[PDB]
Protein backbone atom coordinates (compact mmCIF):
# COMPACT_ATOMS: atom_id res chain seq x y z
CA UNK A 1 0.00 0.00 0.00
CA UNK A 2 3.12 2.21 -0.12
CA UNK A 3 5.74 2.99 -2.74
CA UNK A 4 8.28 0.83 -0.86
CA UNK A 5 6.02 -2.07 0.13
CA UNK A 6 5.10 -2.59 -3.53
CA UNK A 7 8.83 -2.57 -4.26
CA UNK A 8 9.49 -5.18 -1.57
CA UNK A 9 6.78 -7.51 -2.91
CA UNK A 10 7.90 -7.15 -6.52
CA UNK A 11 11.57 -7.69 -5.62
CA UNK A 12 11.00 -10.67 -3.32
CA UNK A 13 9.22 -12.24 -6.29
CA UNK A 14 11.31 -11.14 -9.29
CA UNK A 15 14.85 -11.46 -7.94
CA UNK A 16 14.64 -15.28 -7.46
CA UNK A 17 12.73 -15.47 -10.75
CA UNK A 18 15.50 -13.84 -12.77
CA UNK A 19 18.12 -15.76 -10.78
CA UNK A 20 16.76 -19.27 -11.31
CA UNK A 21 15.49 -18.54 -14.85
CA UNK A 22 18.70 -16.87 -16.15
CA UNK A 23 16.91 -13.71 -17.32
CA UNK A 24 19.43 -11.03 -18.40
CA UNK A 25 16.92 -8.20 -18.03
CA UNK A 26 13.40 -7.54 -16.80
CA UNK A 27 11.06 -4.56 -16.64
CA UNK A 28 7.87 -4.74 -14.61
CA UNK A 29 5.00 -2.32 -14.05
CA UNK A 30 2.38 -2.49 -11.28
CA UNK A 31 -0.84 -0.48 -11.50
CA UNK A 32 -2.01 -0.10 -7.90
CA UNK A 33 -5.18 1.90 -7.23
CA UNK A 34 -4.81 3.42 -10.68
CA UNK A 35 -1.27 4.68 -10.19
CA UNK A 36 1.59 3.05 -12.15
CA UNK A 37 4.83 1.93 -10.51
CA UNK A 38 7.87 0.84 -12.53
CA UNK A 39 10.81 -1.48 -11.88
CA UNK A 40 13.90 -2.41 -13.90
CA UNK A 41 16.63 -5.03 -13.54
CA UNK A 42 19.55 -6.28 -15.56
CA UNK A 43 20.94 -5.67 -19.04
CA UNK A 44 19.16 -5.17 -22.34
CA UNK A 45 22.45 -5.68 -24.22
CA UNK A 46 25.26 -7.71 -22.68
CA UNK A 47 28.00 -6.96 -25.23
CA UNK A 48 27.49 -3.18 -25.34
CA UNK A 49 26.67 -3.35 -21.59
CA UNK A 50 23.39 -1.46 -21.71
CA UNK A 51 21.10 -1.51 -18.65
CA UNK A 52 17.38 -2.20 -18.82
CA UNK A 53 15.42 1.05 -18.71
CA UNK A 54 11.80 2.17 -18.72
CA UNK A 55 12.41 3.09 -22.37
CA UNK A 56 13.77 -0.35 -23.29
CA UNK A 57 11.74 -2.00 -26.04
CA UNK A 58 10.80 -5.65 -25.50
CA UNK A 59 9.29 -8.05 -28.01
CA UNK A 60 5.73 -8.77 -26.89
CA UNK A 61 5.03 -11.85 -28.98
CA UNK A 62 1.47 -13.13 -28.69
CA UNK A 63 0.51 -10.11 -26.55
CA UNK A 64 0.31 -8.19 -29.84
CA UNK A 65 -3.02 -9.95 -30.33
CA UNK A 66 -4.56 -7.74 -27.63
CA UNK A 67 -3.72 -4.80 -29.90
CA UNK A 68 -5.19 -6.79 -32.79
CA UNK A 69 -8.47 -7.47 -30.98
CA UNK A 70 -8.96 -3.90 -29.77
CA UNK A 71 -8.28 -2.57 -33.27
CA UNK A 72 -10.90 -5.00 -34.54
CA UNK A 73 -13.11 -3.73 -31.76
CA UNK A 74 -12.47 -0.19 -32.95
CA UNK A 75 -13.29 -1.19 -36.53
CA UNK A 76 -16.54 -2.74 -35.27
CA UNK A 77 -17.47 0.47 -33.47
CA UNK A 78 -16.85 2.47 -36.66
CA UNK A 79 -19.39 0.36 -38.55
CA UNK A 80 -16.72 -0.96 -40.92
CA UNK A 81 -17.10 -4.64 -39.95
CA UNK A 82 -19.41 -7.03 -38.13
CA UNK A 83 -18.08 -10.14 -36.39
CA UNK A 84 -21.01 -11.97 -38.04
CA UNK A 85 -19.74 -11.11 -41.53
CA UNK A 86 -18.43 -14.08 -43.55
CA UNK A 87 -14.67 -14.16 -44.00
CA UNK A 88 -15.25 -14.32 -47.76
CA UNK A 89 -16.98 -10.92 -47.78
CA UNK A 90 -13.58 -9.27 -47.17
CA UNK A 91 -11.36 -11.71 -49.13
CA UNK A 92 -13.67 -12.93 -51.91
CA UNK A 93 -10.87 -14.91 -53.58
CA UNK A 94 -11.34 -17.51 -50.80
CA UNK A 95 -13.85 -19.59 -52.74
CA UNK A 96 -13.47 -22.92 -50.93
CA UNK A 97 -16.83 -24.36 -49.91
CA UNK A 98 -15.26 -25.06 -46.50
CA UNK A 99 -14.97 -21.30 -45.89
CA UNK A 100 -18.73 -20.92 -46.39
CA UNK A 101 -20.05 -20.27 -42.89
CA UNK A 102 -16.79 -19.06 -41.32
CA UNK A 103 -17.21 -15.53 -39.98
CA UNK A 104 -14.73 -12.96 -38.71
CA UNK A 105 -15.78 -14.01 -35.21
CA UNK A 106 -14.28 -17.46 -35.74
CA UNK A 107 -10.95 -16.08 -36.94
CA UNK A 108 -10.83 -13.66 -34.00
CA UNK A 109 -11.45 -16.38 -31.41
CA UNK A 110 -9.61 -19.39 -32.91
CA UNK A 111 -12.92 -21.22 -33.52
CA UNK A 112 -12.71 -21.48 -37.32
CA UNK A 113 -12.29 -25.24 -37.00
CA UNK A 114 -8.61 -25.94 -36.46
CA UNK A 115 -6.73 -23.27 -38.40
CA UNK A 116 -3.03 -24.11 -38.02
CA UNK A 117 -0.97 -22.46 -35.30
CA UNK A 118 1.71 -20.90 -37.51
CA UNK A 119 1.88 -19.80 -41.12
CA UNK A 120 4.52 -22.06 -42.75
CA UNK A 121 7.74 -20.06 -42.91
CA UNK A 122 7.91 -20.92 -46.64
CA UNK A 123 4.69 -18.90 -47.17
CA UNK A 124 6.49 -15.66 -47.94
CA UNK A 125 4.14 -13.66 -50.19
CA UNK A 126 0.39 -13.11 -49.98
CA UNK A 127 -0.09 -15.38 -53.00
CA UNK A 128 1.33 -18.37 -51.14
CA UNK A 129 -0.84 -17.21 -48.23
CA UNK A 130 -3.99 -17.30 -50.36
CA UNK A 131 -3.05 -20.78 -51.61
CA UNK A 132 -2.38 -21.83 -48.01
CA UNK A 133 -5.82 -20.76 -46.80
CA UNK A 134 -7.47 -22.18 -49.94
CA UNK A 135 -6.03 -25.66 -49.38
CA UNK A 136 -6.59 -25.72 -45.61
CA UNK A 137 -9.16 -28.34 -44.63
CA UNK A 138 -11.11 -27.83 -41.38
CA UNK A 139 -10.92 -30.36 -38.56
CA UNK A 140 -14.23 -29.31 -36.97
CA UNK A 141 -17.38 -27.26 -37.45
CA UNK A 142 -17.14 -23.50 -36.88
CA UNK A 143 -17.80 -22.81 -33.22
CA UNK A 144 -17.25 -26.36 -31.96
CA UNK A 145 -13.65 -26.13 -30.72
CA UNK A 146 -11.03 -23.53 -29.84
CA UNK A 147 -7.51 -24.12 -31.19
CA UNK A 148 -5.20 -21.21 -30.38
CA UNK A 149 -3.54 -20.14 -33.62
CA UNK A 150 -1.64 -17.24 -35.16
CA UNK A 151 -3.14 -17.80 -38.62
CA UNK A 152 -6.73 -17.24 -37.47
CA UNK A 153 -6.47 -14.03 -35.45
CA UNK A 154 -3.75 -12.84 -37.81
CA UNK A 155 -6.13 -13.05 -40.75
CA UNK A 156 -8.76 -11.43 -38.55
CA UNK A 157 -6.49 -8.44 -37.98
CA UNK A 158 -5.54 -8.29 -41.66
CA UNK A 159 -9.18 -8.30 -42.81
CA UNK A 160 -10.59 -6.02 -40.10
CA UNK A 161 -8.59 -3.11 -41.54
CA UNK A 162 -9.57 -3.68 -45.19
CA UNK A 163 -12.55 -1.27 -45.05
CA UNK A 164 -10.35 1.30 -43.30
CA UNK A 165 -8.38 1.59 -46.53
CA UNK A 166 -5.17 1.35 -44.49
CA UNK A 167 -2.61 -1.35 -43.84
CA UNK A 168 -2.68 -3.13 -40.49
CA UNK A 169 0.38 -1.18 -39.28
CA UNK A 170 -1.02 2.15 -40.48
CA UNK A 171 -4.50 1.58 -39.03
CA UNK A 172 -3.07 0.51 -35.68
CA UNK A 173 -0.78 3.55 -35.58
CA UNK A 174 -3.62 5.97 -36.31
CA UNK A 175 -6.50 4.42 -34.36
CA UNK A 176 -4.79 3.03 -31.25
CA UNK A 177 -1.17 3.96 -30.58
CA UNK A 178 -1.34 7.66 -31.45
CA UNK A 179 -4.70 8.40 -29.74
CA UNK A 180 -3.46 6.61 -26.60
CA UNK A 181 -0.01 8.28 -26.84
CA UNK A 182 2.13 5.12 -26.96
CA UNK A 183 5.18 6.72 -28.56
CA UNK A 184 7.41 3.76 -27.67
CA UNK A 185 5.34 0.94 -29.18
CA UNK A 186 6.30 -0.27 -32.63
CA UNK A 187 5.74 -2.93 -35.24
CA UNK A 188 8.88 -1.77 -37.04
CA UNK A 189 11.45 -0.37 -34.61
CA UNK A 190 12.94 2.78 -36.19
CA UNK A 191 16.70 2.85 -36.52
CA UNK A 192 17.01 5.82 -34.15
CA UNK A 193 15.33 3.86 -31.33
CA UNK A 194 17.60 0.86 -31.92
CA UNK A 195 19.75 1.53 -28.84
CA UNK A 196 16.66 1.06 -26.65
CA UNK A 197 15.64 -2.14 -28.48
CA UNK A 198 16.75 -4.90 -26.13
CA UNK A 199 18.14 -8.12 -27.55
CA UNK A 200 16.38 -11.36 -26.74
CA UNK A 201 18.53 -14.29 -25.67
CA UNK A 202 18.05 -17.86 -26.88
CA UNK A 203 20.62 -20.27 -25.41
CA UNK A 204 23.12 -17.47 -24.98
CA UNK A 205 22.81 -15.88 -28.43
CA UNK A 206 21.10 -12.51 -29.05
CA UNK A 207 18.00 -12.68 -31.25
CA UNK A 208 15.11 -10.62 -32.57
CA UNK A 209 11.80 -11.74 -34.06
CA UNK A 210 12.05 -12.80 -37.69
CA UNK A 211 9.55 -11.24 -40.12
CA UNK A 212 6.63 -13.36 -41.23
CA UNK A 213 3.26 -13.11 -42.91
CA UNK A 214 0.83 -11.40 -40.53
CA UNK A 215 3.60 -11.00 -37.95
CA UNK A 216 2.26 -7.57 -37.03
CA UNK A 217 -1.19 -9.02 -36.35
CA UNK A 218 -0.05 -11.99 -34.26
CA UNK A 219 3.31 -11.35 -32.59
CA UNK A 220 5.26 -8.39 -34.03
CA UNK A 221 4.73 -5.61 -31.48
CA UNK A 222 7.53 -4.18 -29.36
CA UNK A 223 7.06 -1.69 -26.55
CA UNK A 224 8.50 -0.20 -23.39
CA UNK A 225 7.30 -0.89 -19.85
CA UNK A 226 5.72 2.57 -19.58
CA UNK A 227 3.78 2.27 -22.84
CA UNK A 228 2.58 -1.14 -21.64
CA UNK A 229 1.45 0.28 -18.29
CA UNK A 230 -0.52 2.90 -20.25
CA UNK A 231 -2.01 0.16 -22.46
CA UNK A 232 -3.12 -1.72 -19.34
CA UNK A 233 -4.56 1.43 -17.77
CA UNK A 234 -6.52 2.04 -20.97
CA UNK A 235 -7.97 -1.47 -21.21
CA UNK A 236 -8.60 -1.67 -17.46
CA UNK A 237 -10.55 1.60 -17.20
CA UNK A 238 -11.34 2.94 -20.67
CA UNK A 239 -13.61 5.75 -19.48
CA UNK A 240 -10.83 8.33 -20.00
CA UNK A 241 -10.44 7.73 -23.75
CA UNK A 242 -11.67 10.67 -25.81
CA UNK A 243 -12.15 8.48 -28.90
CA UNK A 244 -15.52 6.75 -28.63
CA UNK A 245 -14.81 4.20 -31.35
CA UNK A 246 -11.70 3.22 -29.37
CA UNK A 247 -13.52 3.30 -26.03
CA UNK A 248 -16.04 0.91 -27.57
CA UNK A 249 -13.46 -1.32 -29.26
CA UNK A 250 -11.66 -1.69 -25.94
CA UNK A 251 -14.95 -2.71 -24.34
CA UNK A 252 -15.52 -5.24 -27.13
CA UNK A 253 -12.02 -6.70 -26.78
CA UNK A 254 -13.10 -7.91 -23.32
CA UNK A 255 -16.60 -9.03 -24.28
CA UNK A 256 -17.09 -12.73 -23.54
CA UNK A 257 -17.66 -14.59 -26.81
CA UNK A 258 -16.98 -18.22 -25.80
CA UNK A 259 -16.67 -20.18 -22.56
CA UNK A 260 -13.74 -22.61 -22.43
CA UNK A 261 -13.87 -24.19 -18.98
CA UNK A 262 -13.41 -21.26 -16.60
CA UNK A 263 -11.93 -18.96 -19.28
CA UNK A 264 -13.78 -16.55 -21.57
CA UNK A 265 -12.30 -15.64 -24.95
CA UNK A 266 -12.26 -11.95 -25.81
CA UNK A 267 -10.73 -10.35 -28.87
CA UNK A 268 -7.13 -11.18 -28.06
CA UNK A 269 -7.71 -10.70 -24.34
CA UNK A 270 -8.58 -13.74 -22.22
CA UNK A 271 -10.80 -13.42 -19.15
CA UNK A 272 -11.58 -15.35 -15.99
CA UNK A 273 -13.99 -14.53 -13.18
CA UNK A 274 -12.45 -12.74 -10.21
CA UNK A 275 -12.04 -14.08 -7.55
CA UNK A 276 -10.27 -17.01 -9.20
CA UNK A 277 -8.01 -19.92 -8.30
CA UNK A 278 -4.34 -19.65 -9.23
CA UNK A 279 -4.14 -23.23 -10.50
CA UNK A 280 -6.56 -22.34 -13.30
CA UNK A 281 -4.42 -19.65 -14.95
CA UNK A 282 -1.07 -21.10 -13.82
CA UNK A 283 -1.58 -24.57 -15.28
CA UNK A 284 -3.53 -23.26 -18.27
CA UNK A 285 -0.70 -20.92 -19.22
CA UNK A 286 1.50 -23.95 -19.93
CA UNK A 287 2.11 -24.26 -23.66
CA UNK A 288 0.81 -27.84 -23.51
CA UNK A 289 -2.59 -26.59 -22.31
CA UNK A 290 -2.89 -23.09 -23.81
CA UNK A 291 -2.22 -24.62 -27.24
CA UNK A 292 -4.64 -27.54 -26.85
CA UNK A 293 -7.89 -27.99 -28.79
CA UNK A 294 -10.71 -27.44 -26.30
CA UNK A 295 -14.51 -27.57 -26.71
CA UNK A 296 -16.10 -24.13 -26.81
CA UNK A 297 -19.61 -23.10 -25.74
CA UNK A 298 -20.96 -20.09 -27.59
CA UNK A 299 -22.05 -16.99 -25.68
CA UNK A 300 -24.68 -15.19 -27.76
CA UNK A 301 -25.15 -12.31 -27.28
CA UNK A 302 -21.53 -11.82 -26.17
CA UNK A 303 -21.46 -10.88 -22.50
CA UNK A 304 -20.35 -7.24 -22.03
CA UNK A 305 -16.99 -6.71 -20.32
CA UNK A 306 -17.11 -7.93 -16.72
CA UNK A 307 -15.30 -5.66 -14.28
CA UNK A 308 -14.90 -8.48 -11.74
CA UNK A 309 -12.52 -10.19 -14.14
CA UNK A 310 -8.91 -11.25 -14.44
CA UNK A 311 -8.04 -10.12 -17.98
CA UNK A 312 -4.69 -11.31 -19.31
CA UNK A 313 -2.53 -12.43 -22.19
CA UNK A 314 0.84 -14.17 -22.38
CA UNK A 315 3.19 -13.86 -25.34
CA UNK A 316 6.68 -15.05 -26.17
CA UNK A 317 9.19 -14.76 -29.00
CA UNK A 318 12.45 -16.61 -29.58
CA UNK A 319 14.23 -14.40 -27.07
CA UNK A 320 11.48 -12.65 -25.12
CA UNK A 321 8.81 -13.54 -22.60
CA UNK A 322 6.00 -11.12 -21.77
CA UNK A 323 2.84 -11.25 -19.69
CA UNK A 324 0.05 -8.75 -19.08
CA UNK A 325 -2.78 -9.01 -16.56
CA UNK A 326 -5.26 -6.70 -14.88
CA UNK A 327 -8.42 -6.70 -12.77
CA UNK A 328 -10.74 -3.78 -13.64
CA UNK A 329 -12.86 -3.99 -10.48
CA UNK A 330 -9.76 -3.74 -8.28
CA UNK A 331 -8.03 -1.16 -10.52
CA UNK A 332 -5.01 -3.47 -10.31
CA UNK A 333 -2.57 -4.63 -12.97
CA UNK A 334 0.86 -5.97 -13.85
CA UNK A 335 3.11 -5.92 -16.90
CA UNK A 336 6.15 -8.24 -17.07
CA UNK A 337 8.67 -7.96 -19.91
CA UNK A 338 11.83 -10.07 -20.08
CA UNK A 339 14.47 -10.44 -22.79
CA UNK A 340 14.43 -14.23 -22.27
CA UNK A 341 11.56 -16.67 -22.74
CA UNK A 342 10.71 -18.79 -19.69
CA UNK A 343 7.81 -21.17 -19.04
CA UNK A 344 4.47 -19.38 -19.00
CA UNK A 345 3.38 -21.17 -15.76
CA UNK A 346 6.28 -19.60 -13.82
CA UNK A 347 5.46 -16.20 -15.34
CA UNK A 348 1.78 -16.41 -14.42
CA UNK A 349 2.51 -17.76 -10.93
CA UNK A 350 4.80 -14.81 -10.21
CA UNK A 351 2.27 -12.30 -11.54
CA UNK A 352 -0.45 -13.99 -9.47
CA UNK A 353 1.62 -13.82 -6.29
CA UNK A 354 2.35 -10.13 -6.76
CA UNK A 355 -1.21 -9.11 -7.61
CA UNK A 356 -2.74 -11.29 -4.89
CA UNK A 357 -0.63 -9.54 -2.25
CA UNK A 358 -1.76 -6.12 -3.52
CA UNK A 359 -5.54 -6.63 -3.54
Amino acid at each position, epitope marked *: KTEQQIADIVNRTITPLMQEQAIPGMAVAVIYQGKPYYFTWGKADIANNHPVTQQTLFELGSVSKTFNGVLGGDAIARGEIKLSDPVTKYWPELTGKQWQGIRLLHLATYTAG*GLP*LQIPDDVRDKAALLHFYQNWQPQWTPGAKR*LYANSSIGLFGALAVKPSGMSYEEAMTRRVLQPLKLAHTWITVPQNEQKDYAWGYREGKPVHVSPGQLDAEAYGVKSSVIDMARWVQANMDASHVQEKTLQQGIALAQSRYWRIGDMYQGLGWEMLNWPLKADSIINGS*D*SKVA*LAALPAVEVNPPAPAVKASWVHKTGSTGGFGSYVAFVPEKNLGIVMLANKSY*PNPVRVEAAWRILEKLQ
Partner: nanobody, 121 residues
Protein backbone atom coordinates in the same frame (compact mmCIF):
# COMPACT_ATOMS: atom_id res chain seq x y z
CA UNK B 1 5.11 -26.84 -14.82
CA UNK B 2 3.20 -29.51 -16.75
CA UNK B 3 5.30 -32.60 -17.35
CA UNK B 4 4.58 -35.68 -19.45
CA UNK B 5 7.07 -38.51 -19.01
CA UNK B 6 7.08 -41.15 -21.74
CA UNK B 7 8.44 -44.66 -21.27
CA UNK B 8 8.20 -48.19 -22.60
CA UNK B 9 10.20 -47.65 -25.78
CA UNK B 10 12.80 -50.16 -26.87
CA UNK B 11 14.13 -52.36 -29.63
CA UNK B 12 11.98 -55.25 -30.86
CA UNK B 13 11.73 -57.62 -33.80
CA UNK B 14 8.86 -57.20 -36.30
CA UNK B 15 5.59 -58.78 -35.20
CA UNK B 16 6.29 -58.36 -31.48
CA UNK B 17 4.49 -56.14 -28.97
CA UNK B 18 5.30 -53.04 -26.93
CA UNK B 19 3.32 -51.04 -24.34
CA UNK B 20 4.18 -47.35 -24.04
CA UNK B 21 3.33 -45.49 -20.85
CA UNK B 22 3.02 -41.73 -20.35
CA UNK B 23 2.98 -40.46 -16.77
CA UNK B 24 1.61 -36.96 -16.29
CA UNK B 25 2.00 -34.39 -13.54
CA UNK B 26 1.37 -30.72 -12.92
CA UNK B 27 -2.20 -30.55 -14.22
CA UNK B 28 -5.65 -32.15 -13.99
CA UNK B 29 -4.88 -35.07 -16.29
CA UNK B 30 -8.47 -36.34 -16.25
CA UNK B 31 -9.87 -33.11 -17.73
CA UNK B 32 -8.05 -33.25 -21.08
CA UNK B 33 -8.01 -35.50 -24.13
CA UNK B 34 -4.60 -37.10 -24.67
CA UNK B 35 -2.79 -37.96 -27.89
CA UNK B 36 0.15 -40.13 -28.89
CA UNK B 37 2.26 -38.52 -31.63
CA UNK B 38 5.38 -39.90 -33.31
CA UNK B 39 8.32 -38.54 -35.29
CA UNK B 40 10.15 -40.75 -37.78
CA UNK B 41 13.86 -40.44 -38.68
CA UNK B 42 14.37 -37.33 -40.78
CA UNK B 43 10.63 -37.02 -41.38
CA UNK B 44 8.26 -34.65 -39.62
CA UNK B 45 5.76 -35.35 -36.86
CA UNK B 46 2.76 -37.59 -37.38
CA UNK B 47 -0.35 -38.14 -35.28
CA UNK B 48 -0.83 -41.68 -33.93
CA UNK B 49 -3.85 -41.80 -31.64
CA UNK B 50 -6.18 -39.86 -29.36
CA UNK B 51 -8.34 -40.73 -26.35
CA UNK B 52 -11.00 -38.51 -24.78
CA UNK B 53 -11.30 -37.50 -21.13
CA UNK B 54 -13.42 -40.31 -19.70
CA UNK B 55 -11.47 -42.76 -21.86
CA UNK B 56 -14.65 -44.01 -23.54
CA UNK B 57 -13.64 -42.51 -26.90
CA UNK B 58 -10.62 -43.73 -28.87
CA UNK B 59 -9.41 -42.69 -32.31
CA UNK B 60 -6.51 -43.98 -34.40
CA UNK B 61 -4.68 -43.09 -37.59
CA UNK B 62 -5.12 -45.40 -40.57
CA UNK B 63 -1.52 -46.63 -40.36
CA UNK B 64 -2.14 -48.19 -36.93
CA UNK B 65 -5.90 -48.79 -36.76
CA UNK B 66 -6.51 -52.33 -35.54
CA UNK B 67 -2.97 -52.91 -34.27
CA UNK B 68 -2.70 -50.29 -31.50
CA UNK B 69 -4.93 -49.68 -28.49
CA UNK B 70 -4.79 -46.38 -26.62
CA UNK B 71 -6.14 -46.21 -23.07
CA UNK B 72 -5.82 -44.21 -19.88
CA UNK B 73 -5.94 -44.53 -16.09
CA UNK B 74 -7.11 -41.21 -14.67
CA UNK B 75 -6.75 -42.54 -11.12
CA UNK B 76 -2.99 -42.98 -11.57
CA UNK B 77 -2.87 -40.15 -14.15
CA UNK B 78 -1.33 -42.34 -16.83
CA UNK B 79 -1.86 -42.71 -20.57
CA UNK B 80 -1.05 -46.03 -22.27
CA UNK B 81 -0.54 -47.21 -25.84
CA UNK B 82 -0.45 -50.94 -26.52
CA UNK B 83 1.31 -51.65 -29.82
CA UNK B 84 0.80 -55.05 -31.44
CA UNK B 85 2.14 -56.54 -34.67
CA UNK B 86 4.70 -53.80 -35.14
CA UNK B 87 6.38 -53.03 -38.46
CA UNK B 88 9.67 -51.34 -39.37
CA UNK B 89 7.41 -48.49 -40.52
CA UNK B 90 6.61 -47.76 -36.86
CA UNK B 91 10.24 -47.08 -35.89
CA UNK B 92 10.17 -43.54 -34.49
CA UNK B 93 10.15 -41.42 -31.35
CA UNK B 94 6.87 -41.35 -29.43
CA UNK B 95 5.44 -38.52 -27.33
CA UNK B 96 2.22 -38.05 -25.42
CA UNK B 97 0.57 -34.66 -25.19
CA UNK B 98 -2.75 -32.90 -24.77
CA UNK B 99 -4.84 -33.36 -27.89
CA UNK B 100 -4.50 -30.69 -30.57
CA UNK B 101 -6.21 -32.74 -33.29
CA UNK B 102 -4.15 -33.92 -36.26
CA UNK B 103 -1.54 -31.32 -37.23
CA UNK B 104 1.61 -30.94 -35.13
CA UNK B 105 4.01 -28.96 -37.33
CA UNK B 106 6.02 -25.87 -36.33
CA UNK B 107 6.39 -26.64 -32.62
CA UNK B 108 8.46 -23.62 -29.26
CA UNK B 109 9.33 -25.30 -25.96
CA UNK B 110 6.76 -28.08 -26.02
CA UNK B 111 7.72 -31.69 -26.72
CA UNK B 112 8.89 -33.83 -23.84
CA UNK B 113 11.80 -36.23 -24.37
CA UNK B 114 9.55 -39.02 -25.67
CA UNK B 115 10.77 -42.59 -25.96
CA UNK B 116 12.13 -44.36 -29.02
CA UNK B 117 10.64 -47.47 -30.61
CA UNK B 118 12.72 -49.43 -33.12
CA UNK B 119 11.47 -52.40 -35.14
CA UNK B 120 13.91 -54.21 -37.43
CA UNK B 121 15.92 -57.42 -37.84
Amino acid sequence: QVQLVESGGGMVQPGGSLRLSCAASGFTFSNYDMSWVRRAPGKGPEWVSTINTGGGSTSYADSVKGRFTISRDNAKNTLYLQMNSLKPEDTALYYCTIDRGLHYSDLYDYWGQGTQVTVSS
